[PDB]
């Protein structure tokens, strides 16, 4: 309940402060992973089949920096808002919501 | 490509429930009126000249 509720509140009520903090975090996760030789190899290898040959590392902070909270909120709604979630659990799931409940959990009339 | 009529309708009016309600409020209005107009007409056709509407002529203003 709390999860989907955080999704929803993200695409309709993002605050600049909030996004701002989550911004910074991303910087760090994405700098700190690159400490060491093996991690840096990976970034390079994979990065060239993924994103092609680019090494977007320094751009990142620029791209990351382009995020005004509106950006984060419109981006968020495309994927989350009224999209049918894909769900999987492994018992005891007896309390795991019904698919229809999860689904309506994707829009905001109340809850 | 263009959005199916539905998809157009969808992204213009239903994404936001606020818009979705609004829609419903306005359609509830427009629809009443056509329904009544059509439905009434239909009915009145089935009883041509049976109803006062049809018959007020005889004793009206001479």
């Amino acid at each position: 309940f709390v999860l989907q509720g955080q999704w929803m509140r993200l695409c309709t009520s993002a605050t600049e402060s909030e996004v701002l903090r989550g911004k910074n975090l991303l910087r760090n996760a994405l700098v700190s992973h690159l400490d060491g030789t093996t991690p840096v190899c990976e970034d390079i290898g994979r990065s060239l089949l993924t994103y092609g040959r680019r090494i977007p590392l320094a751009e990142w902070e620029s791209r990351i920096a382009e995020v005004d909270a509106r950006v984060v909120r419109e981006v968020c709604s495309k994927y989350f808002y009224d999209q049918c979630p894909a769900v999987a659990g492994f018992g005891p799931i007896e309390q795991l919501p019904d698919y229809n409940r999860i689904r309506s959990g994707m829009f905001w009339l109340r809850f | 490509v263009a959005p199916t009529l539905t998809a157009r309708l969808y992204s213009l009016l239903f994404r936001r429930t606020s818009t979705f309600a609004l829609t419903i409020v306005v359609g509830a209005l427009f629809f009443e009126r056509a329904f009544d107009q059509g439905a009434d007409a239909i009915y009145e056709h089935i009883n041509e000249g049976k109803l006062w509407k049809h018959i007020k002529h005889k004793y009206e203003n001479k």
Partner: peptide
């Protein structure tokens, strides 16, 4: 935030509702 927009459509709805309904 999104409240003004949404409060504005919610205010619209009540309005047209009364107007028509009533």
């Amino acid at each position: 935030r999104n409240w003004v927009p949404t409060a504005q459509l919610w205010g619209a709805v009540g309005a047209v509702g009364l107007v028509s309904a009533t």
